[PDB]
Design a protein around this ligand. Sequence first.
Ligand SMILES: *[C@@H]1O[C@H](CO)[C@@H](O)[C@H](O)[C@H]1NC(C)=O
Ligand SMILES: *[C@@H]1O[C@H](CO)[C@@H](O)[C@H](O)[C@H]1NC(C)=O
Ligand SMILES: *[C@@H]1O[C@H](CO)[C@@H](O)[C@H](O)[C@H]1NC(C)=O
Ligand SMILES: *[C@@H]1O[C@H](CO)[C@@H](O)[C@H](O)[C@H]1NC(C)=O
Lengths: 168, 90, 159, 69, 169, 89, 138, 138, 83, 89
Amino acid sequence: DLRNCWCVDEAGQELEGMRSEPSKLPTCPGSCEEAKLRVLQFIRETEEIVSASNSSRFPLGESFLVAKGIRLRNEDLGLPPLFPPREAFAEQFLRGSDYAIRLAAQSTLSFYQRRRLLRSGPYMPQCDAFGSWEPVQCHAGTGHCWCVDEKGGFIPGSLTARSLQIPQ
Amino acid sequence: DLRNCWCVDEAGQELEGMRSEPSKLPTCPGSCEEAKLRVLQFIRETEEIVSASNSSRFPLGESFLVAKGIRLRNEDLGLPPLFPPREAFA
Amino acid sequence: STFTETTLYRILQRRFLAVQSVISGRFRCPTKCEVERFTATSFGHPYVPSCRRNGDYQAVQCQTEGPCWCVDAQGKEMHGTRQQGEPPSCAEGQSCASERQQALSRLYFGTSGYFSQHDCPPTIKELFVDSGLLRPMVEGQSQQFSVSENLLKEAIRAI
Amino acid sequence: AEGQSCASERQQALSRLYFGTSGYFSQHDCPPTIKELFVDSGLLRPMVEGQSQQFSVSENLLKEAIRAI
Amino acid sequence: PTVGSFGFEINLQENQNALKFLASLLELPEFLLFLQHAISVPEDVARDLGDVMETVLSSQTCEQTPERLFVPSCTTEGSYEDVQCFSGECWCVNSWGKELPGSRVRGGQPRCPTDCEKQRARMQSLMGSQPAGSTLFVPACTSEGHFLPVQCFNSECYCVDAEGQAIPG
Amino acid sequence: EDVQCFSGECWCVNSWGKELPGSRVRGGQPRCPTDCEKQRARMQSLMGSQPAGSTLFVPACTSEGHFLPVQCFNSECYCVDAEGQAIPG
Amino acid sequence: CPIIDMASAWAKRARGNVFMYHAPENYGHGSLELLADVQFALGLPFYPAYEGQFSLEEKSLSLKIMQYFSHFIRSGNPNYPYEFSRKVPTFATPWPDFVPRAGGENYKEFSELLPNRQGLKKADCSFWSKYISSLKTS
Amino acid sequence: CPIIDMASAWAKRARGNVFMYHAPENYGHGSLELLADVQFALGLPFYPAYEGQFSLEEKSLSLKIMQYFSHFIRSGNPNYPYEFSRKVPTFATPWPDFVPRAGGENYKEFSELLPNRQGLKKADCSFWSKYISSLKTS
Amino acid sequence: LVSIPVCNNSSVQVGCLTRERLGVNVTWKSRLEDIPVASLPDLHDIERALVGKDLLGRFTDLIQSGSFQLHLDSKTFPAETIR
Amino acid sequence: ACLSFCQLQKQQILLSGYINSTDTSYLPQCQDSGDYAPVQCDVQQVQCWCVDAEGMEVYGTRQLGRPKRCPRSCEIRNRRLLHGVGDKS
Ligand SMILES: *[C@@H]1O[C@H](CO)[C@@H](O)[C@H](O)[C@H]1NC(C)=O
Ligand SMILES: *[C@@H]1O[C@H](CO)[C@@H](O)[C@H](O)[C@H]1NC(C)=O
Ligand SMILES: *[C@@H]1O[C@H](CO)[C@@H](O)[C@H](O)[C@H]1NC(C)=O
Ligand SMILES: *[C@@H]1O[C@H](CO)[C@@H](O)[C@H](O)[C@H]1NC(C)=O
């Protein structure tokens, strides 16, 4: 009881957000909550760039240049290098192709709709209370109740589109 | 002095921004002022999207979707179809 | 069991419809559209239908110098359309707006590609139209076919 | 300056980025006639090529060979 | 013209040539191998073997589906409009769903081809199915897509409008 | 720096100015090749300048760029680290 | 070029289904007496001797190749595990049979995506089969 | 294939500069006794008879081709209008001379960009020149 | 085109309220196990394909900008308000 | 829009039970297409029978509440033939 025990995933990468004390027990999720944490973190930074959109701190042509692969450092534009968090966006708009193309499309939906309907959002993967995956996975918004086994992954064929009975 | 005489470029395209009266003489630029007018119009709409950036009327991810070739009509997002000038940017 | 599935019956219908090909231009009996077109042209009364060579109803159907609307594949009126003057545009290859909705619902589906990958039919593009099997049909030696492909899909159906 | 010529070349692209509009001149802003006469048209290929590895021909010796001769 | 069993048009020369082709269709080793794979089609995708011929004759135009995050742009009524953009490239499409090949420009937006290009690229492709020297009329036109003002064919050069009909004289 | 982006594609470059060919992915950002790929694509290219049958050591590795844990050459298979030196024994 | 006319003369007999593969050049691990098509087929990336020497992509390729030969030895067709059930094969790409005709002669390339090519060495198997077959007899 | 060995045997003489072009297939206006390389060269898009029958791109191509032959008939080199001034040719792409060697044998393709290709019909001018030249003598 | 029935016996109810105004509360309903994904791939669509100009918009435009003539006991009479 | 042959009869029965005020224990239950549903009965749903698409009641199929299947136009004509109303084929 004098050592600092954090916990990692496979291949030793730390789930950052904590650091253990010498006299604590680190909570460590497994295999379903990470896929719920990242969706919570995706909705989190969806709500981040709708706040900076409301706050009017960045130009409207800023995301166009990051899309086109043009990177302006803060040394170029006269302003101090860290006085805005400028390099936040260029990181989280270049995380992936399919990632950032949804993160903009979710935010422009969530900007106008909050400024004004449908009770639909993204899909949060529901888990059990143990921590594993619930074997049935329903997506409200479409009607797809499919099934997922073994630390994630759609088992093929088991898709159900708008039926009365739950897919056992 | 009862006819409406506008003026065009080559291949007959109207320099929009005016319409002549029956008793007026239309000013028509040539060959250098158009290349100065379009630069004035380029700085003009440069100053347009810095005003809407100050006014906070559009999301920051709006220009990212137009860059990626995704076009959201105003029918999709619940809002009335012309209540912002949405299709200006695209 | 009965006379139907006997080979004496199915030769007779093949010998019937092969004669009907050089007589009527169809390798089939006339459907409901073509019978209604003939009995309207015979007695000369208005509302003659329109049949687009497939046996089904042509979609937009107008009557003589009057109102016009569009019809499904059964002979009944579409209620959201009666346009005097120009013919309407009912689903005439307008499948983008239905397909636009499938892309937007795929756009708004979570994140990270956990399932969104798994959301022409399967095993047809890589067995029939690519693997030399359709190439005997829509191909030949020269132009002298004019082989209608609402006759070959009637040829395999009736035979 | 150990092959760090990007930051100088970054400035040439930014000054080309901020040059008016419409491409009136900005098109006209390896040297010319060398890429398509020497290194492509079979003339350099006798020098940096041979039969096998047994050269180790230093190219601060061949540019000294043509200089002194 | 001709009237058949009902109000039908009978090009009997067209009908006789189809049944000559239909007899030659059945006298093939590769139709029996087409018919073997037509049995192995499921019932929901094709009810009858004519529905097998419905899907196969339709699947010859189905190019493989694009990237999953692509969304097309339709018109006011919905008519699958001309310039069709994605991440960097835009292109131009027909009314049906496919794209015109070679029109995939990079950045900005392409010009959809005028009446010239879809007339001459047909007859450039039809030129490729001719005997040697056997030319036929290819409408040559400018870089802007508008016609060259004097088209030529068969050692005769005539002036044209912006549409295609030869103005007389 | 390594990942070098433009309108839709990004790619990966050397220190000198040129880009690594085949690394021009579309959308997102590529992974610059590890110590495996620039070692084996040399010796895949050097394999193309050999007599027939005259093999030489090509370091095969995973899709993540990390080495396969047991490399092999000359009918001898040895275990490796994540760097390239053969651990003895 | 023998293996084409081995297949094409066998397929014009029209007595059974004819299938053809072709392995690509696989540069790595040339320390084996077996070559790049049998090792993907007879379970070699899963062997206890060959533990760790393969990736998780050559190994996962060499399970859809084992499913190819298994569905052939069970039913004479590498898309259907039985000779009486014809549901859609949802494990890999559907193999098309070797149609012995122009516009056909399909085969399978044992790469990561398992694509359907069309015509193997048709330039060179017209050389040894059509040019020389007129030079040898005349 | 004669015009290659016409050039390459002439270039190994090393008595003068050797240059080679090759016109592409130009589908349009096949109503002329002249063909696609002379009409770009001897001023045919500017003729009073052929007014309007050419674009502003085939015409502007056929001025940089007239500059090619003019600088050759003046100085024996289609990059320099004189034999004593060697400033950089800033009108089109710099023509490289026909180097009669492997890794060379360059030419010019008369298209819209005027690019430098390298080796014309080297497959087929090895057929009539190296295969048959062993079949005819043996 | 696919057919989606949206009514039943319990879709409409009436009753005289103020002795010359016979009210009616039409209740359209449609089961979700009738509408495929290829028809309407979103619950937002089934909102807008029902409230839109095809069904609800056309019906409001019928009773507002038009006429509606019921036929009982050989007596034809209008039947429209907006409320 | 005008009224189908079902909803002609469903109004004609019901006002005859309103003008004469004597109730009749049958009213049709046609679908959206206008023609009759095959199964037909009254509100109490005790004897539901199959009916022809033209309108006449198919004689014989008066079950006690729910037909699992209804005969179609061949099997009615194929069986009435076997009872003997002409045309022995
Ligand atoms: C933006 O922020 C203001 C406060 O500054 C708040 O009142 C408003 O609700 C926020 N959202 C929008 C969409 O304006
Ligand atoms: C409408 O149908 C339902 C279901 O069969 C039934 O319960 C109801 O009584 C019917 N309505 C009337 C007015 O009979
Ligand atoms: C229908 O509308 C009336 C009048 O507004 C209202 O009183 C009633 O609650 C509504 N619903 C039903 C089920 O009748
Ligand atoms: C019953 O009502 C009908 C309604 O049309 C009427 O014609 C008839 O005279 C009434 N009385 C009898 C006895 O049918």
